[PDB]
Amino acid sequence: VDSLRHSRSRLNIYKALASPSLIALSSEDPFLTAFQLSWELQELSKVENEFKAEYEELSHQCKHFAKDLLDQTRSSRELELILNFR
Amino acid sequence: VDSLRHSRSRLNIYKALASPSLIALSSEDPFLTAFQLSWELQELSKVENEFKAEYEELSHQCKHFAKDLLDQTRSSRELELILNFRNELARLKLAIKYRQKEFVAQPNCQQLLASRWYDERHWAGKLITCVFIGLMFPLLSLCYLVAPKSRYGLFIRKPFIKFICHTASYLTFLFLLLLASQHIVSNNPDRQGPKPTTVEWMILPWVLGFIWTEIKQMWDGGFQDYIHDWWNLMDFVMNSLYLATISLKIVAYVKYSGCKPRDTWEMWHPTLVAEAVFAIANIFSSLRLISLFTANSHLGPLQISLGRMLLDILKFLFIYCLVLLAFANGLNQLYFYYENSEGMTCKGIRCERQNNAFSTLFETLQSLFWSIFGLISLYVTNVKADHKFTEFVGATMFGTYNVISLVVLLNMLIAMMNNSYQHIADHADIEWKFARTKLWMSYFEEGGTLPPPFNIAENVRLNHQYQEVLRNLVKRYVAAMIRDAKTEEGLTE
Amino acid sequence: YSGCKPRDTWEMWHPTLVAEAVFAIANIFSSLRLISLFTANSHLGPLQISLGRMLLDILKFLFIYCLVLLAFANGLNQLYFYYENSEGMTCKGIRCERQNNAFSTLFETLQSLFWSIFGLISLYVTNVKADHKFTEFVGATMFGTYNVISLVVLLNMLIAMMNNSYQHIADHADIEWKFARTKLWMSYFEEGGTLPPPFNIAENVRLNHQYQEVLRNLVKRYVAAMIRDAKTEEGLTE
Ligand SMILES: CCCCCC(=O)OC[C@H](COP(=O)(O)O)OC(=O)CCCCC
Ligand SMILES: CCCCCC(=O)OC[C@H](COP(=O)(O)O)OC(=O)CCCCC
Ligand SMILES: O=C1CN(c2cn[nH]c(=O)c2Cl)CCN1CC1CCC(F)(F)CC1
Ligand SMILES: O=C1CN(c2cn[nH]c(=O)c2Cl)CCN1CC1CCC(F)(F)CC1
Ligand SMILES: [Ca+2]
């Protein structure tokens, strides 16, 4: 009954979820909740084809957040534990 | 009495008028007073050709102001009221008329257009559903034209279906055209102007329908706003050929009729020119498929970008033609004394054994043109006698022409288009969307509603609410950009 | 079938012939898969990938060119098909020592138009036994127009397209090459293949316990070190 409002609300919510601060505060596994959001946004940027640029950019920032979160390690065994966990 | 002062005063006044703040304060309809100023400045930048850059920039800022003023809406019905105010979407048609590009490539407006277009998946489903309609369009069009009721009559009336039907009709046209040249339906060549064949009958309705559609369109336009689109020019020149073919074929029908061999016909026999003209018409008719691909999403932008690089090539073929003329005029002088033609079976370059190429001016032009693609063998520049000096100077000129026109001039064409592609590609989608929107709006009315084969107070209250909408938009804009974005600029001394 | 019959006197579609042809095409594809081996090198990898990326920038183009080719072939067939000569010639077509009868059939016309790109079609094709020296000119005109369009105006635009796209792609070259190489490596780390094709025929509560500590340390370091420390490095404003 309201296309514009619904679309904009969806975009606002998704931009709210994909912010490094909020992820770091309230989340269990940062790495997963980053991957999931990246994939969901990337695929969703196809069914909606007017706000494509925003969704692509959001996926990209999720990618870079995940990388930088990985980077902050200072121990080999730390890294191996992170990469092995299932 | 004072050119400098007058020109500068004009420029100052026009820059004063085209400022978002002043427009927002003292104006009745922001949207109009933006369009009008944009058009006036754009056209005025042509008669005055010293301050061109300023006028172009001013037109651009007017365009962007109009777009941003549109953007500040937060209600679907708000948007529809804005676009409808003046039988439907009149203001958007006005924007299309005023070449206002950025205003139309707005995501909200695009969603509105898409929703009114599809009117209710994946590529396999879309493929099967798409191909399905073509295998049944004729009876569907029949159902509309005989029983315009809500059983099948509305189904065609939906735009997307109308577009599918017209595409299917055009594909049928090309199929019949391509089938025209089959020896199964080409009973015999040796006949002066025989009666039209079966395929020659089935073509005629499509020609008539296309002619009528172009007549309607030119009646609407009248050589104004109609000729500008190069596709319409192509349609005109492409229709004229078919008309001439019909007339001349009738002439041949009534003058000559016999079973005389094809070989022993004199030049300018009407049937021959009829066939040639028909073939050229076939080429132009088939070549108009490219215009169908603006409706795709992967090819559209690319097609437009190829479209833009033609003033970057036509301004070049001219120089090349000039060089070609100079060199042909040269090489004719050296040779024309050696016109051999001593009982040869053929003559010219268009023969198995090339001979006598550099004899006439026309022949020399032909040789020079074909030399580009390396289809001219070298032993042309040779004479029956042994004057082994002119044979060398001729070869020297020929080589110089080849160097100039294939290593020094063409590479510069490449290095020109290459640089222009970055100037253009930056503005690709903003323009592709405008083209696609024009294509769509061509269908939204009850005007054509038929494939060419089967072609033969009231507003005081509106003003009352519209003004409130305008007040809200201008308030939001003034508060949200010209104030809020000012407090984001870098410091200074 | 089994006999000692001469190779020359075999009818078309003899099974051995199509067998040889299919085997040869299979040989081409089999040999062509070496390029995929070079992602494991360091000097060629990135280059191979970058060539890999420019295929949606060419396939979206061969389509347009094919459309133009179809239009022009459909044109040139109309003009000529009345002159199908075939009066006892030893061969026929363009694939012969003396080219003849090129613009007769639709398929033949398509062949001629395709080969014309590389300049392997001699000019005297557009000529007929009779002396109708008007159609012989219009045919040459169409042929020349096709050559101009498809070799001076359309191909250069392919060049100027890929050229611009290379800078869009090359910026992201190693970040992608490394991913491809890593996938190639991970294809081998398991005890799955372990043989060349010729010779082919509580437990986790403690882990969660330590993993959570690692996560806490990482997130603490990140929050302190970037979203705080890098905020105090931005330029001034009004
Ligand atoms: C690149 C020069 C090589 C010299 C070869 C040579 O001596 O032959 C003369 C050539 C032509 O070759 P011939 O006529 O066969 O002698 O003249 C040029 O094309 C000059 C190009 C002029 C370009 C501006
Ligand atoms: C560059 C024009 C030189 C003129 C040469 C000439 O008169 O010959 C006609 C040429 C073809 O040469 P002939 O058929 O041999 O006459 O027509 C074109 O190719 C036009 C290209 C059309 C390009 C859009
Ligand atoms: O463009 C013309 C011009 N016409 C003429 C007129 N005279 N001669 C012609 O060869 C042609 Cl094509 C009528 C047919 N279309 C195609 C339209 C419907 C199908 C499409 F959406 F793909 C592109 C627009
Ligand atoms: O890629 C194929 C697919 N195969 C088939 C299957 N069927 N037909 C074929 O021609 C081929 Cl090559 C099996 C062989 N490899 C090569 C692999 C090992 C060697 C390499 F690391 F270089 C690249 C990967
Ligand atoms: Ca038209």
Numbering used by the authors:
A (entry chain A): 187 to 272
B (entry chain B): 187 to 272, 284 to 317, 324 to 659, 696 to 732
C (entry chain A): 459 to 659, 696 to 732
Extract from the study:
Here we report five cryo-EM structures of TRPC4 in its apo form and in complex with the inhibitors GFB-8438, GFB-9289, and GFB-8749, as well as CaM. Within the TRPC1/4/5 sub-group, TRPC4 and TRPC5 share the highest sequence identity of 70%. Both proteins can form homo-tetrameric channels that allow the passage of Ca2+, but also Na+ ions to a lesser extent. The architecture is typical for the canonical TRP channel family with a transmembrane region (TM domain) where the pore region of one protomer domain-swaps with the voltage-sensor-like (VSL) domain of another. The cytosolic domain harboring the ankyrin repeat (AR) embraces the coiled coil helix in the center and the N-terminal ankyrin domain is associated with the TM domain via a helical linker domain.
Similar to the GFB-8438 and GFB-9289 inhibitor-bound structure, an extra density was observed inside the VSL domain region of GFB-8749-bound TRPC4. The structure of GFB-8749 shares a common scaffold with GFB-8438 and GFB-9289, consisting of three six-membered rings. A cyclohexyl group and a pyridazinone ring at opposing ends are connected by a central 1,4-disubstituted piperazinone ring. The main difference between GFB-8749 and the other compounds is in the terminal cyclohexyl ring with a substitution of a difluoro group at the para position. Thus, the interaction of the protein residues with the pyridazinone ring and 1,4-disubstituted piperazinone ring are found to be almost identical with that of GFB-8438 and GFB-9289. The terminal cyclohexyl ring substituted with the difluoro group is stabilized by the hydrogen bond interaction with Y646 of the TRP helix and the cyclohexyl ring is stabilized by hydrophobic interaction with L495 of helix S4 and Y373 of helix S1. Interestingly, we have observed that the inhibitors GFB-8438 and GFB-8749, which have lower IC50 values than GFB-9289, interact with both the TRP helix and the VSL domain, whereas GFB-9289 exclusively interacts with the VSL domain. Similar to the apo structure, the channel is closed at the lower gate in all structures of the inhibitor-bound TRPC4. In the ligand-bound structures a characteristic lipid density is situated close to the pore which is either phosphatidic acid or ceramide-1-phosphate, its structural analogue.
